[PDB]
Amino acid sequence: GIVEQCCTSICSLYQLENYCN
Amino acid sequence: GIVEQCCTSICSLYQLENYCN
Amino acid sequence: NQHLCGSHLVEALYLVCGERGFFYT
Amino acid sequence: NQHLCGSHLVEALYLVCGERGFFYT
Amino acid sequence: HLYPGEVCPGMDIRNNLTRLHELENCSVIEGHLQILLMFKTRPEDFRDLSFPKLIMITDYLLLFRVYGLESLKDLFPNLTVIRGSRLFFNYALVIFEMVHLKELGLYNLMNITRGSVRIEKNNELCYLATIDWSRILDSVEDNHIVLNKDDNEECGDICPCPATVINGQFVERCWTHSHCQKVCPTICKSHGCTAEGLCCHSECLGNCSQPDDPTKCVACRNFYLDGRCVETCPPPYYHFQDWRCVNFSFCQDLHHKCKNSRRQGCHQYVIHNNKCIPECPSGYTMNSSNLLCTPCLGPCPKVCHLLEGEKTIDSVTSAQELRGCTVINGSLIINIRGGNNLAAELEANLGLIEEISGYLKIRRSYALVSLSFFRKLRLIRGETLEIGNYSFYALDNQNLRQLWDWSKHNLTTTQGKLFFHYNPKLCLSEIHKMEEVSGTKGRQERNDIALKTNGDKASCENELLKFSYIRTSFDKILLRWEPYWPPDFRDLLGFMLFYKEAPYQNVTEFDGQDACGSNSWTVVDIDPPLRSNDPKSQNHPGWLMRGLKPWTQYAIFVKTLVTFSDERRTYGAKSDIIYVQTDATNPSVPLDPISVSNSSSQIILKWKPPSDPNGNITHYLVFWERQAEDSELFELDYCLKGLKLPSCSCPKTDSQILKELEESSFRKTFEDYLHNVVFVPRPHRPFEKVVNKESLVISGLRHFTGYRIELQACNQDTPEERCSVAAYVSARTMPEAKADDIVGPVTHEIFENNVVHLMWQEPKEPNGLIVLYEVSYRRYGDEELHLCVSRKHFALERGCRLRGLSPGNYSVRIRATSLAGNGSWTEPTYFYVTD
Amino acid sequence: HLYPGEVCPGMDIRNNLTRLHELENCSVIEGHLQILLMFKTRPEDFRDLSFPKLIMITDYLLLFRVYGLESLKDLFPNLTVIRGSRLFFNYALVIFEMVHLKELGLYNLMNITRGSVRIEKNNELCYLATIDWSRILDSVEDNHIVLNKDDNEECGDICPCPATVINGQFVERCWTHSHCQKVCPTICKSHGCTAEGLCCHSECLGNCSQPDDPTKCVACRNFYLDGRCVETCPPPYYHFQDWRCVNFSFCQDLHHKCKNSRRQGCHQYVIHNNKCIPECPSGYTMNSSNLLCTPCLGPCPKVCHLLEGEKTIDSVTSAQELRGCTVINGSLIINIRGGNNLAAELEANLGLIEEISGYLKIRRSYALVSLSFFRKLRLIRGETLEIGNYSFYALDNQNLRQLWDWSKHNLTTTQGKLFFHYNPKLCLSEIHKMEEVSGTKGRQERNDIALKTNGDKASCENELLKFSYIRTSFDKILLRWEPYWPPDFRDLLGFMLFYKEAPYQNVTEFDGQDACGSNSWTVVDIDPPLRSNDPKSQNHPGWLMRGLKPWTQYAIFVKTLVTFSDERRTYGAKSDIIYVQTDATNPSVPLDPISVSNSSSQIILKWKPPSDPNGNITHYLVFWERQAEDSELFELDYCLKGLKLPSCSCPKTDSQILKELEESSFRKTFEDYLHNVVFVPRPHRPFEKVVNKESLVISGLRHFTGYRIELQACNQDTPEERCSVAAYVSARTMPEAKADDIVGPVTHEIFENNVVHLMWQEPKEPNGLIVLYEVSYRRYGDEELHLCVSRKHFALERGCRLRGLSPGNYSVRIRATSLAGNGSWTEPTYFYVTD
């Protein structure tokens, strides 16, 4: 699910930090 | 008007006899 | 066929009405 | 730019979280 | 007189010949003249009637399917002018499907004013390439002369008319077997001339009686008034049908005789600006008594109540019914099929419209370039809509390029939905800019307007590429431009490098044109630069061209390549066009060194300029040299046998391109699935230099020797003298004079054993090399007995001898025979030996 | 043992190395094994641990972005089988983006059961062309080895494995620097072999300990039971995970331990047909006590409650979630990007579905050929619809050809609207036939489904053309087929004649393919036949081909050409394909006539067969002839100097095609405006013939002469003997024997003036022509003084003479020197003259 949240629109540093625990 | 009455659909002998008086 | 289009219509109209002539306003 | 897609993100995500690791159920 | 005949209204001729009787006494015909459909007609009854007085036809003359006419010269001898106020499907003279028409016979066509001419489908015509329409017409582009008997050169075409060179040939232009086409002298084109070439008064056309007279020519230009014709008519009269002026006593009763609504062929004629117009335009309303029309209070729109809701515009005939109207109370469809262009007449015909009520639909056009002929569109109402609830509909327009210039234009759409398909020269930027002037912003249908085929064969990008480093050589050229990425860098296919040569910098914009041969641009394809993931990168791409001619002008530009997708983004980029040149180099070899031996101190030699110039050459390098003449010949006894005498592709593989985009995006979707599983959110020689010449003579040089002369052509000299290779030619003088033979004392010595030794002198400056002293001794009653002595024999002996002689008196004579020929003889000496 | 280790569940490895400790005592791994994303990892700590006992891997093994491993041979030495029950995006083994992987090291890969293998994006690997996947895999088509270090041949590849010839080369196949690939003998492929080649018991794979034993190999095929493996397990046990069988005591607590809903990773396993299946399919319902599932009362379908309403089908891993389901309670989108084909697995994976609730949409597919994998579609509900209110959506399918065979199929659509665009191999007949099975007949949108681009590059016609007259020649061929018209004959552009040659009648159906090159059909264009307006017409069209090779098989067919319009009519016509042949003719000249002179009565001569056979040739025409040997040499004095010794395109110009259709329909729209205005409604030489040979000898023929021998090849003979032209070669025998010299009485006659006349005899049958009698006379103490006598000198004298001789004894000898060489000498005779 990380592509359509972070390749289709703009992506934030608070979003992808959830992916690393 | 004689084309779309006699080239697009089928055409009858009673139709085109009006064109000759 | 009887889709009297193009140069059929200039002949076959004369073939059915070659003596009365055509109609005009 | 920050369109972290393709082979950017495999390096970009490690750079921000290279000590806790990623998450899995 | 000018127009001595009567006026006649328009008329039609059908099914008989008896209705042509009422053309008895007139000259001008308003409206049009249609002759149509006589089948029971022999060719005999056309050889007794004529219409000699008919001169002026206003709108159009129509002949179609008449059985029995072979020529019109026995009917219409004197007609000259086709005025062309109303037309007939962009034409003014149409001959269609004739059965007996051998020759046209129209020897008096002077000026076709508005429209064109077209003759089709007549398998009997001739002399059609002898007409020269450009002398009569004012346009040649919308004419149509195809599919006749003159498709094959078989109808004779021997005819006695200045035989113009208007084409690439000296073709003679005549109408029929007995006439020539008349052509004016070109100092005065449309004024009309006489047989002596003295052209007439400026307000005449065609034939005249006497020149420089406005009262006795045949047909004027502007108007007519009572045996005269003036440019603008004085106002005891008002103009009428743009060919006459006439008093208001005339125009008043045509308003009166058919204000009684008994025929809709009238219009209530109104005086305005000295014109007898049918309807004066918007912003005006008529008064009752004065019969003029005053400016109306407030705005008064001259509405145009369109019959049956929609009226397709096929040509200028269909468009002229809307002239003057400004409020379209129906819908409107433009449909121009084929042809050249109509965008020069639509502006002056319907360019005064402001309000359309229904929808505007543009289908099947081929030759529109812009919609700018609509001058004043601002509001599209849409009380009714087209099916699917649409209001603007463009489909299959092969050359529609610019919709409008938005900086000086407005457009509102109250309701409705727009639509676009198959517009290969229509950009996706314009239709989005069309949305931003429109009242709609997001009223879509899904599927709404197209995104893939609209302008697929005509490029637009809103990103540009600048070059960085250019490298110049004489043969190769190295190119390097800036790095660039789309917003997702996996979507990149490389670049396209188009290049071709040009003699000048008047290079057209690359429209997009390919060929499987060579008449246009050639193209090379480039692998995309590798990813560095680093904003300071090696990734400046490059490519090196190989097979280039030196000292040649060139023009290059590059283009991006992205996978077309559903997102209206990553349009790619276009580099600007630039100019580069290859360096100069060595020249090539000069051609054809031709030398002629005429004199001894004149040795002419000419050549040809070289094939490859490699830039401007500067001079030539000539050289010459003398030679000792082949000393192997010095040891031949010249008395034996043998003496010598001197003097298919791949432009596109589109399936593999479809395969190339397939497997590349197959790599895109593979890692797209991998990321969505593994990541989870948390909840030296004598010479000279010659210039500006092609021949050269060299003087002061020895008679009878060979000079090997070689010649180079060469570029600039003082820094790095670099020239081509040479080509060697031997050169010789005229044949030698008396000096090949010698004069000297022929003395002899008698020995006691009857051997006589002769002493003489040799030639000193010989014919190059003396080879044989043809000595000859003669006794009385005996023939001239010849003897032989070679070069080495004279060299060892210093003389010659004769052995075994009878006692008597002899006559000895010597001939110096050289290798270039024989000399004269010496004195026959008298020596005597006795018993 | 067979599988001596522990059963050991699936696991993932990430961010460290300490979680690989719990693979201490495992051998089989159910599920999959993911090693993923170690960055802070040195290459040192991989050289001390291993996993020697891991043998069987069920589903897939995945390696992606690990920093520090160079080979797997120190980790996985003994793994042999990849079972492939579940897959990973059509693959079973994927290596992706490695940084340190020098060499693979997988020397024990035996059988990849289901799926494929793929390695990309590794700039460090080698030996990848030395693996021979076709011995391990059962398919090669869906493998993908692109973009690695072995894109360029640079990292060695020198390696010690039978060096198979599976490709066109003798490549040796080895895994690493120290291992080479084991290959079984091909009499028993999947049964597993030993080092001596004696392959094992039939229920084993790969390595074995001892052959023909089902108890001591390494890995069987079907199942496993307690040190043995049987094809079907006996029913004290039930099968489980298609690799084991086990008692019902084992499966029963797995239903019990997690009937407690604490994890959704189980399924309530039920007994059915001796299987421990997760869910038994439709028409069955489980019983409580017995734990089986009995035949269900009435119909009760196994519904498949799809999460979030739609689930895209990308590959076989996406499709395996729908296995067994039959009622889709959502929507379904198939999307297979790129690749080869998946239509061999979609039948066995989702071919058991009946009810879809939402919509079915086929977008962006490239390599489908038919939708026949959907076996049992009958009803599409459409409680929800796609945007635009749609239910069936096909878009951008480059090879979709047949939807369904309607004669054995049904389909209902309750509501909704269908849609079609960009389907270049999809006919307009099928979509209309799709409507006639559908519940809808005229539910359209305007614009509904497309009509112009759907199958624009793939032909269908429902009108056929029959040929009438065929004419055969050797070079030309004249063709004539039947007349044909559309219902509006103005719409006709002519015909397209495609033709090419073929060696046999296995000619493929012309799918549609062009090139600039020459690898496919060539095509000529034909003007349409002229209109007669007569049902008995000359209009039988025809065209004559010119440049054909004689005696060649050919295949021809013709095609019609109509303007595409908005009406779904006038589809044109296609002629059937046929076969014709050119006629035979003269043959060509034979090649390389080589003759060797070895004997007198053996003159060998060989040749080559001709280039153009022009059919089966029959025989040869040889000729030979003797000759008088050039009698100008008979008058030469053979004592002077000189003796002789014998021995680019245009596939399509589409804009002009768009110009051709434009101006033709411009003529159509012209007369349409004409009719609607003018008509108003009322209100000899020795020879032989040789056969089946390439060399020939001729005997019984004269020694030392030339024979000009010419040779023709030829076709059939007795009606109209027609052969080719010849080529002439001279031929000579071996050089002559003693007969060039003559034996005879050397007699002399002494005259008183010391002239001696010699009488002898000449050679009778000479070496063709004797040219010189080399006579020589010798005095005592004097050398052999030679003298000369010509052919004409002997012929006039019948002898020779010698003038001015000293008195003495002489030795006179004669040599007969011929033109082919010198003979022997005669007897030196002793004649004496005295003082």
Residue numbers in the entry:
A (entry chain C), B (entry chain A): 1 to 21
C (entry chain B), D (entry chain D): 3 to 27
E (entry chain E), F (entry chain F): 1 to 160, 169 to 655, 683 to 718, 756 to 907
Anything the authors wrote about it?
The insulin receptor (IR) is a member of the receptor tyrosine kinase (RTK) family and a key regulator of metabolic homeostasis. The extracellular α-chain is composed of a leucine-rich repeat (L1), a cysteine-rich region (CR), L2, fibronectin type III (FnIII-1), FnIII-2α, an insert domain (IDα), and the C-terminus of the α-chain (αCT). The β-chain contains extracellular IDβ, FnIII-2β and FnIII-3, transmembrane (TM) helix, intracellular juxtamembrane (JM), tyrosine kinase (TK), and C-terminal domains. IR autophosphorylation on intracellular tyrosine residues stimulates two major signaling pathways: the AKT pathway initiated from insulin receptor substrate 1 (IRS1) and the mitogen-activated protein kinase (MAPK) pathway initiated from SHC-transforming protein 1 (SHC1).
During the classification of the IRA43+Ins dataset, we observed a population of particles (23% of total particles) with a symmetric T-shaped conformation (4.18 Å). Only two insulin molecules but no aptamer associated with the T-shaped IR. Each insulin bound to site-1 and site-1′, which suggests that the second insulin competes with A43 in binding to IR. At saturated insulin concentration, four insulin molecules independently bind to two primary sites (site-1 and site-1′) and two secondary binding sites (site-2 and site-2′) at the FnIII-1 domain, which leads to a symmetric T-shaped structure.
